[PDB]
């Protein structure tokens, strides 16, 4: 339909050694 | 040799196991049966508060007045531990011992959190999940990484009020493309 | 024998991009499925070097049909546009009863064989490419059958074996098979891994694949014994880290591996 969007923010959350990640074999540490 | 004292264990004979915390008292230390259903509970404890570690000030600094019943009820309610797992943990801590705590601050983690797993392990044609909150029109959205110079990115989105908020505490739906502009409407938290 | 790196996070371009110029690493390996929203096109001018893909979450074994075609639809493009050296996926449960393992599962390599043969053959030709399968860090039991199971997966099927050569060390420190018990598979072999490992939180005495360290010794030495079945013209080797991922430590390695298989 319509939508308002008036702000967007980007939101942290943690991840993998430097953050904003994806996925991986290795087990986890 | 064997995996437990005088016993050969596959893996397969240890699935059931490997989401119970409870299990991990089946055999003795020192085997390698023992320590592979550990090594599988540890790695359902550091999904669950490496990334959200609000939880872990409530109640005790290991978690596991949290940890373990959790995952008990988890196993009860057959959820599939997908990415709509933080959201779950939600839903249990909103019938928990420590219900307080549930700040606004933790819950938009957890969401966030969700979002941010459906990005990173959704494996489907779709690059968007949105989450709309019972109490609030605003929404937060994970996005799936288009280029190479950013991973996921996780948004709080506000907006006017004009839209259905979800009947239920949480909605789902999902975007096809990186553009919001059209509402196909809520749909139930996934399981 | 061509030296690799392994890229699962974008963050990490610069880090390969320049780990290509110093000449540390010859091609590059793309855990491809994490990609699959960035235009083909533009992945494909990141990389001056050749690629190789990864797949993580095929779940070709445990999939639904229907599921893995789209999945296979979707793949070709990239395929098509980056021309990989090879494609790997996993074998591996990923799910008991509908319900996720974030550790993943041993397949029972008895029970499981007609099952996962049927499934490669298919998944194969949904790719129109040879698909070479991973084995598995063995921790419990029942792993001392992997070699002949995968031997068997590729003479059935016409698959390939992707021996992760640091995954079988840490299977014969948690009292699977001897790592000389793959020399048939290494023969045939044209597509290895080599990553760090760790112990377990709880029992060093057990070794984790974590792709977190430095390469330990009984690695190395691995690769040294079986250095002759191996090296082959057209054989490549992946350097796999996923934590750590600072340009020194990683730099060490694809040095050591170098040391292993000079230019
Ligand atoms: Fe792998
Ligand atoms: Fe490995
Ligand atoms: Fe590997």
Redesign the interface.
Same mark, same amino acid.
């Given at each position: 339909m319509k939508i308002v969007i008036v702000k967007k923010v980007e939101i942290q959350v943690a991840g993998?050694?430097?953050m904003?990640?994806?996925?991986?074999?290795?087990?986890?540490? | 040799?064997?995996?437990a004292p005088g016993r050969? @264990?596959?893996?397969?004979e240890? /699935?059931?196991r490997?989401?119970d915390p409870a299990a991990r008292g089946d055999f003795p230390?020192?085997c390698?049966?023992?320590?592979?259903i550990?090594?599988?509970i540890?790695?359902?404890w550091h #999904?669950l508060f490496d990334i959200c570690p609000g939880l872990l000030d409530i109640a005790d600094p290991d978690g596991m007045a949290i940890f373990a019943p959790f995952m008990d009820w988890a196993?009860r309610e057959?959820? #599939?531990?997908?990415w709509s797992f933080y959201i779950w943990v939600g839903r249990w801590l909103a019938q928990s011992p420590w219900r307080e705590r549930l700040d606004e601050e933790l819950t938009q983690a957890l969401l966030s959190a969700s979002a941010a797993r459906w990005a990173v /392990?959704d494996?489907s044609?779709d @690059?968007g999940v949105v989450l709309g909150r019972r109490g609030s029109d605003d929404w937060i959205i994970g996005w799936?990484?288009? #280029?190479?110079?950013?991973?996921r990115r996780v948004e709080l989105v506000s907006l006017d009020g004009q839209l259905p908020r979800p009947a239920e505490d949480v909605g789902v739906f999902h975007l096809a493309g990186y553009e919001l502009d059209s509402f196909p409407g809520w749909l139930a938290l996934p399981r | 024998m061509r030296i690799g790196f392994n890229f699962?996070?974008?963050?990490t &371009?610069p880090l390969v991009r320049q780990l290509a110029q110093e000449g540390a690493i010859d091609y590059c390996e793309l &855990?491809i =499925?994490?990609?699959?929203? +960035?235009?083909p096109q533009?992945?494909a001018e *990141?990389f001056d070097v050749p690629v190789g893909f %990864?797949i993580?979450?095929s779940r070709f074994i445990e999939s639904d049909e229907e599921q893995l075609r =789209?999945?296979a639809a979707?793949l070709r493009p990239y395929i098509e546009a980056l021309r990989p050296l090879y494609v790997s996926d %996993?074998i591996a449960?990923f799910? %008991?009863?509908?319900? *996720?393992?974030?550790?993943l599962?041993?397949? !029972?390599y008895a *029970?499981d064989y007609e099952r996962v043969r049927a499934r490669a053959a298919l998944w194969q030709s949904l790719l129109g490419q040879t698909i070479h399968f991973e084995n598995y860090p063995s921790? +419990?039991?029942?792993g001392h059958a992997a070699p002949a199971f995968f031997q068997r997966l590729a003479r059935d099927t016409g698959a390939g074996v992707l021996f992760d050569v640091s995954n079988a060390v840490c299977a014969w420190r948690? !009292?699977g098979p001897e790592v000389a018990a793959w020399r048939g598979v290494m023969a045939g072999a044209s597509h290895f891994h080599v990553?760090g490992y760790?112990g *377990?939180?709880?029992?060093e005495? +057990?070794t +984790?694949?974590? %792709? !977190?360290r430095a390469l330990a010794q009984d690695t190395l030495d691995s690769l040294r014994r079986h250095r002759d079945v191996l090296d082959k013209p057209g054989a490549t080797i992946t350097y796999?880290r996923?934590?750590?991922?600072d340009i020194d430590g990683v730099r060490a390695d694809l040095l050591a591996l170098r040391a292993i298989f000079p230019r």
């Open positions: 993998r050694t430097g904003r990640c994806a996925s991986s074999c290795g087990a986890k540490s | 040799a064997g995996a050969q @264990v596959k893996d397969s240890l /699935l059931a490997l989401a230390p020192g390698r049966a023992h320590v592979r550990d090594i599988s540890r790695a359902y #999904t196993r057959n959820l #599939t531990m997908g /392990l494996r044609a @690059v799936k990484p288009n #280029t190479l110079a950013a991973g | 699962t996070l974008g963050e &371009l &855990l =499925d994490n990609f699959m929203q +960035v235009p533009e992945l *990141a %990864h993580m979450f =789209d999945f979707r %996993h449960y799910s %008991h009863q509908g319900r *996720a393992l974030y550790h599962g041993e397949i !029972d *029970a921790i +419990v039991d029942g948690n !009292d990553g760790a *377990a939180f709880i029992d005495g +057990v +984790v694949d974590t %792709h !977190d796999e996923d934590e750590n991922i």
